Structure 1
Amino acid sequence: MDMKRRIHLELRNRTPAAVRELVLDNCKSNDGKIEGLTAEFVNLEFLSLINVGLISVSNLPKLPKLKKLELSENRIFGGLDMLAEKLPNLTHLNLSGNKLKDISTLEPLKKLECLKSLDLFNCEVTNLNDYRESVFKLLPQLTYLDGYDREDQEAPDSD
């Protein structure tokens, strides 16, 4: 079941304007891009693209209200500049298990105003020295990187 199918399977005869949390993981990508979602999704605030073979997020929809996006287990190697404009209100991003290999790749996220968490587990960029410090200086608004704030104090629950 590719995205276009499961989306409708998850649409559940409920109009796109009335979805607030959509879960689409392990499904597929057309070739390496999200296909099936459309801008009519306006009430969505939790999209989970986990394990969907995804080579980029170029053709992502426009979700004003998105706040909890997660692209873990995919193979994004850049092109995150789109997420800034297309998800102005995103405040919880989960890029774990992807193919990011440089701090430069995370430069585009600097212009997201309301960012609160960035999970970056199992990514080749996490093997660097002064990794967390460099990330926290490139993304000053961040207050939880990988789960801990600044002194390795776990992020409080109920987020």
Structure 2
Amino acid sequence: GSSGSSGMDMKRRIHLELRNRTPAAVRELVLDNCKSNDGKIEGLTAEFVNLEFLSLINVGLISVSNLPKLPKLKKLELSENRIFGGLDMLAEKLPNLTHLNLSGNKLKDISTLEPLKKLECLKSLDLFNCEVTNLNDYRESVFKLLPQLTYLDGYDREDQEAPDSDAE
């Protein structure tokens, strides 16, 4: 509720929130400081279809198959996760995924963004705290693979940091 409490299964928490109103009537819901089941979302329900803002950090997740079909959700905050690879389910699940943070994940290669080529909407992305960031010309090793990408690590092609307001 008011005082952030840790050590609570996803579903268990999500419930405390729904108490306000249907899970399909919500728009912004931060599911941070929660406990997932062996890295398997056992709460998030497709009902969130409406939801647009989804914050997932320090949740200790490894799988991204459970993720419900969210054709609306455009922003997906993901950090401090154990996502090594297999970012394909996101291409189909979130076909309109524009905002996606991949800083901190267990991505130590470029192939981890192979299935990301399908998504021609990804405007902004972050891959900080990753071995891939070290790879030779990593900045280019990502652009060449993902042409649709406009922003990389905050900065854009012109090497100009992203905006603050009125940002789609």
TM-score range, shorter chain: over 0.9
- TM-score, length of structure 2 as denominator length: 0.90
- Residues 67-111 of structure 1, C-alpha deviations (whole Å, 9 max, x = no match): 100111111111210001101111100011111011001111111
Q: Structure 1 residue 134 and structure 2 residue 133: aligned? A: no
Aligned position for 1:90: 97
C-alpha contact (below 8 Å) 1:56/1:77 kept by paired residues = no
1:49 to partner: Cα distance: 0.7
Cα distance, 1:12 vs. partner? 3.3
Report the Cα offset of residue 158 of structure 1: 1.7
Q: Give how far 1:11 is off.
A: 1.9
The aligned counterpart of 2:78 is 71
| Gaps in structure 1 of 5+ consecutive residues | none
Structure whose residues are more often helix by fraction: 1
> Structure 1 length normalisation: TM-score?
0.95
Q: After TM superposition, give the deviation of residue 26 of structure 1 in Å.
A: 2.0
> Are the equivalent residues in 1 in contact too, given 2:120–2:149 (CA < 8 A)?
no
Aligned Cα root-mean-square deviation (Å): 1.1
8 A contact 1:56–1:78 mirrored in 2: no
Task: Tell me if the contact between 1:42 and 1:64 (Cα under 8 Å) persists in the aligned partners.
Answer: yes
For the Cα contact (< 8 Å) 1:77–1:100, is it kept in 2? yes
After the TM superposition, which parts of structure 1 deviate over 4 Å for at least 4 consecutive aligned residues? none
More strand by share: 2
State how many pairs are aligned. 159
